[PDB]
């Protein structure tokens, strides 16, 4: 089967490690959630096409500007992650992550992924954000950002509840297949 490469980028604690773990295991880890993700090669069948999707994370690389780009060679799709409970992580998308992803991966499709969508109705999250004069990322703010950065699309998921996780990785496979 055809082999495609995926790299997930985004600020630290934007849920990117959790997202890769929950998809590569097919559930939220009941006993222990690992701290790190090594790599994974998923066998995905999307729209009748069989693909080998190699998964890679950039967690731990966020402060090392010369090490981090070594993750980019031959990437076919980028999941550009942000957390819906962290409006500040969305502000770092167009001026930090997008210029870098477009410089090292020109023509590579980017999916803007809003993680932790379950925290949109979490009372503790809304209270913590209200103290810092903020609120959880509204769905139209994510769509407006994806539109502004020329992303292939906008998607939302929750690694805690597993809602939307399968759709994100099937869509990333379709985006990687387009040439």
């Amino acid at each position: 089967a055809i082999r495609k490469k995926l790299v997930i980028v985004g600020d630290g604690a934007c849920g990117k490690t959790c997202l890769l773990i929950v998809f590569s295991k097919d559930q939220f880890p009941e006993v222990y959630v690992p701290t790190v993700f090594e790599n994974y090669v998923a066998d995905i069948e999307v729209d009748g096409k069989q693909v080998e999707l190699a998964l890679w994370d950039t967690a731990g690389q966020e402060d090392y500007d010369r090490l981090r780009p070594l993750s980019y060679p031959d990437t076919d799709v980028i999941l550009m992650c942000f957390s819906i409970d962290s409006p500040d992580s969305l502000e770092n998308i167009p001026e930090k992550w997008t210029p870098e992803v477009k410089h090292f991966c020109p023509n590579v499709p980017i999916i803007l992924v809003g993680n932790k969508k379950d925290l949109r109705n979490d009372e503790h999250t809304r209270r913590e954000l209200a103290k810092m004069k903020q609120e959880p990322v509204k769905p139209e703010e994510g769509r407006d950002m994806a539109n502004r950065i020329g992303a292939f699309g906008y998607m939302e998921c929750s690694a805690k509840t597993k809602d939307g996780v399968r759709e994100v990785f099937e869509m990333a496979t379709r985006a990687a297949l387009q040439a």
């Binding site: 222990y32 701290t35 790599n39 731990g60 090392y64 993750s71 060679p73 031959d74």
Partner: protein, 235 residues
């Protein structure tokens, strides 16, 4: 990888690796701390196993089955013998610390109380200097190693045969040549993540909290120098 160690790290966590009657005699904070220490060792064991696939399966296989220039093999797997010695020694020390902590009559029940001392030795002095120079060299030759691999795969029919043949086993699904090189470059950036989470559950003994805080500062210092020493070479 040896069967004894593979079985010892087969479970998803420390709570699943030990007998349930042993787990139930411990405080939740000890279970949580041990879960991250077990992940550090389990991922170090997988890392040493990635380096053994590079040296014995890929590198040695090319020397014994192909008529490639040994300079081409060196370009494909830079500093792998050096990396293998550093991490095999570190893994050896971690595994002996686990064996020392084993409950008599058991080969699986253990609680590691000291780890910081071992991490300070690894990430300080001559030991850290050798890792910094080795990783600065490996990461500067990383892109050239991928380009050399891709050229050999697209021009040499015998190299393609060799690759298709050795990577055929299921156990090697995510351990092809390029996957092994990226797994190795990414290893060093996992240590602060693993040590910070271990530290978060090591406030019981104060000497341990300090030793883990020193080890954390030493790893970040190593990453900073490795990152400063990188200068990507070209094919």
């Amino acid at each position: 990888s040896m069967e004894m160690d593979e079985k010892d790290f087969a479970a998803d966590s420390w709570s699943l690796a030990v007998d349930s009657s042993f787990l139930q005699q411990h405080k939740k904070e000890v279970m949580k701390q041990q879960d991250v220490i077990y992940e550090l060792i389990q991922t170090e064991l997988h890392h040493v196993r990635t380096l053994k696939i590079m040296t014995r399966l890929f590198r040695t296989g090319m020397l014994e089955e192909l008529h490639l220039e040994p300079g081409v093999v060196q370009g494909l797997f830079p500093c792998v013998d050096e990396l293998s010695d550093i991490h095999t020694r570190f893994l050896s020390q971690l595994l002996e610390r686990r064996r020392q902590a084993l409950c008599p009559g058991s080969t699986r029940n253990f609680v590691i109380h000291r780890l910081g001392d071992l991490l300070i030795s690894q990430f300080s002095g001559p030991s850290a200097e050798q890792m910094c120079k080795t990783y600065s060299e490996f990461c500067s030759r990383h892109s050239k190693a991928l380009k050399l691999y891709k050229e050999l795969y697209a021009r040499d029919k015998r190299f393609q045969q060799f690759i298709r043949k050795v990577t055929r086993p299921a156990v090697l699904k995510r351990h092809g040549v390029q996957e092994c090189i990226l797994l190795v470059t990414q290893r060093i950036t996992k240590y602060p993540l693993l040590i910070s989470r271990i530290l978060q559950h090591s406030h019981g003994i104060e000497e341990e909290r300090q030793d883990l805080t020193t080890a954390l500062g030493l790893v970040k210092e190593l990453l900073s120098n490795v990152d400063e020493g990188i200068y990507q070479l070209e094919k």
